[PDB]
């Protein structure tokens, strides 16, 4: 079927690497057929390593180019 | 030349029960356990008889 | 289809979107122009020039620009 087999990764702690050289790290709970993610406890990794905290975020599917686990399935 | 025959199943299903007086209604070959052709051969290769078999 | 199918099992030269070149023996293609190249070389350009080797390369269709023949078949 069309959904990504992302079911494994849920509630484990992800890093993402986003289009345009951006990085965010997250505990995950969402996916839909386009891979639109809903990330929780989401940190923004700025260029300089000055880190922000931000709340729950949606991501557009096409913006992702990798999706990595910081703590295992 | 009358070599080959090919019948539909309503034909066969009739012919079977016309013949029914001659045929025996054994559904499976378990009956002939020591009463088949192979068993008699053993009774002929040895010198020793099956009770109802030929001699 | 029928024009592409003529090429099969030959030794094909592909030019990718970024400017790279692959040269490979060609045995698959698909409605999105995916490819499987086989026994394959990665090749880049006195102006310096270089030749790297790759195996059984599976090319996602988006990258392809053009492909060309230069060999008789590896029979």
């Amino acid at each position: 079927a069309h959904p990504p087999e992302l079911k494994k990764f849920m509630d484990k702690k992800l890093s993402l690497k986003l289009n345009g050289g951006r990085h965010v790290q997250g505990i995950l709970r969402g996916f839909d057929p386009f891979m639109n993610l809903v990330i929780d406890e989401c940190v923004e990794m700025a260029t300089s390593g000055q880190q922000n905290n931000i709340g729950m975020v949606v991501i557009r599917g096409n913006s992702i180019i990798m999706l990595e686990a910081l703590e295992r399935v | 030349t009358y070599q080959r025959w090919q019948f539909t199943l309503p034909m066969m299903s009739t012919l079977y029960r016309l013949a029914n007086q001659l045929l025996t209604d054994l559904v499976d070959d378990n009956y002939f356990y020591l009463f088949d052709l192979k068993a008699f051969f053993t009774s002929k290769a040895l010198n020793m008889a099956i009770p109802g078999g030929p001699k | 289809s029928s024009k592409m199918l003529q090429h099969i099992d030959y030794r094909m030269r592909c030019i990718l979107q970024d400017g790279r070149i692959f040269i490979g023996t060609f045995k698959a293609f698909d409605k999105h122009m995916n490819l499987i190249l086989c026994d394959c070389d990665e090749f880049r350009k006195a102006e310096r020039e270089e030749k790297r080797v790759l195996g059984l390369v599976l090319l996602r269709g988006e990258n392809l620009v053009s492909m060309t023949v230069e060999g008789p078949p590896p029979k």
Binding site: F9, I64, L67, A69 | - | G55, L56, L58
Partner: protein, 83 residues
């Protein structure tokens, strides 16, 4: 439906060791686990080469389909009953 020969060879590739290069220029080298019909791969136990030289090891990774621009499938597959 006519999901043709290449994606079947991708499914055939699973459980081996494949190399996989993304638009940006990162080169991954990892053991495959599953691959989907749009080429979303999961990959395990990777040694990644960065665009500028550096190596790193990784636990597990999932690589969006349209973001790839070759895989290096393991050579023994040339015999496979897809071909």
């Amino acid at each position: 439906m006519s999901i043709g020969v290449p994606i079947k060879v991708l499914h055939e590739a699973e459980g081996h060791i494949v190399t996989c290069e993304t638009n940006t220029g990162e080169v991954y080298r990892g053991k495959l686990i599953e691959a989907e019909d749009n080429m979303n791969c999961q990959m395990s136990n990777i040694t990644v080469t960065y665009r500028d030289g550096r190596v790193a090891q990784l636990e597990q990774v999932y690589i969006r389909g349209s973001k790839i621009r070759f895989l290096i499938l393991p050579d023994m597959l040339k015999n496979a009953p897809m071909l």
